[PDB]
Design a binder for this molecule. Structure first.
Ligand SMILES: *[C@@H]1O[C@H](CO)[C@@H](O)[C@H](O)[C@H]1NC(C)=O
Ligand code: NA
Lengths: 28, 252, 28
């Protein structure tokens, strides 16, 4: 319900320094 | 964490520090999965060949931390363990098969910007996300090199590895409750988990719902960041049923 | 508890991981 979602990022619509590296990896 | 970078604040709010009472030492990491339940590796809590066998009264958990050592007043909460459950088929003689354990907090931790549980994957989340080439994230206050302590929480993104490749990287028997992750020796990047990182979570972010899912538990490896070696992770979904059981039964 | 102790160390040691010491990681 609450879980998986970071108060200081997801919930504040905000991206940490290296999230992109993870998403990009799904594309390759 | 070898070749990591410093975590941001509240970047990994499920991250838990497992703390030894007397003497005071960092034992390994763990992860918050609910307000009462903590998931770590079993080999942190029990490993007979080293006469290692802790109990609910030997340990403490520190939640919401960032600095490894500093007491973080009005941020970190500390909790006491009510019950420990190591997996019944955890084999510590041969290859740390089923290296997983559950800890119940005496009191339910309160959630902050700093403290928040992680998602456990269901069948297809595990099946969609956990694929070789896909990167996950590892966190801990473990050592910086295979023997050196970090100042604060360290974080690294490691690619999952093809099961063939895991198996032909080692002489150790790779059961189905393990997966491995890390760079190939000429992938240019590198980095691994290290000592005192075990039990810490390997998580991935779902591209469908922005949620983080703990896919693996940091389990074992032949050293740290060794070329042509990878890091091994307890497959959290394979063990979902046991987790399910321990929660539904013990602790209402 | 959470009750300013100052009797909890802020200078301790990361313990020793059997996990990292399997196989070639076995130490002398
Ligand atoms: C470890 O210690 C506990 C508590 O005394 C004991 O009940 C348990 O059976 C022990 N496990 C082993 C096999 O060392
Ligand atoms: Na490696």
């Amino acid at each position: 319900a609450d879980c998986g979602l970071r108060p200081l990022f997801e919930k504040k619509s905000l991206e940490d320094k290296t999230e992109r590296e993870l998403l990009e990896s799904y594309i390759d | 964490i070898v070749e990591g970078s410093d975590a941001e604040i509240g970047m990994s709010p499920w991250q838990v520090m497992l703390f030894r009472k007397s003497p005071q030492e960092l034992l390994c990491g763990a992860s918050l999965i609910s307000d009462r339940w903590v998931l770590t590796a079993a080999h942190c809590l029990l490993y007979p060949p080293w006469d290692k066998n802790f109990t609910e009264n030997d340990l403490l958990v520190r939640i919401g931390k960032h600095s490894r050592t500093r007491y973080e007043r009005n941020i970190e909460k500390i909790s006491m363990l009510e019950k420990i459950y190591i997996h019944p088929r955890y084999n510590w003689r041969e290859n740390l098969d089923r290296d997983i354990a559950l800890m119940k907090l005496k009191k339910p931790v309160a959630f902050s910007d700093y403290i928040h549980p992680v998602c456990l994957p269901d069948r297809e989340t595990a099946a969609s996300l956990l694929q070789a080439g896909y990167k996950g994230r590892v966190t801990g206050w473990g050592n910086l090199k295979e023997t050196g302590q970090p100042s604060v929480l360290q974080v690294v993104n490691l690619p999952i590895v093809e099961r063939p490749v895991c198996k032909d990287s080692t002489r150790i028997r790779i059961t189905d409750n393990m997966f491995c992750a890390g760079y190939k020796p000429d992938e240019g990047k590198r980095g691994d988990a290290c000592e005192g990182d075990s039990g810490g979570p390997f998580v991935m972010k779902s591209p469908f719902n922005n949620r983080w899912y703990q896919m693996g538990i940091v389990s074992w490896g032949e050293g740290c960041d060794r070329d042509g070696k990878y890091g091994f992770y307890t497959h959290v979904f394979r063990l979902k049923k046991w987790i399910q059981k321990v929660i539904d039964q013990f602790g209402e | 508890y959470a009750a300013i102790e100052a009797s909890l160390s802020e200078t301790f040691n990361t313990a020793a991981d059997p996990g990292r010491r399997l196989g070639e990681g076995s130490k002398p």
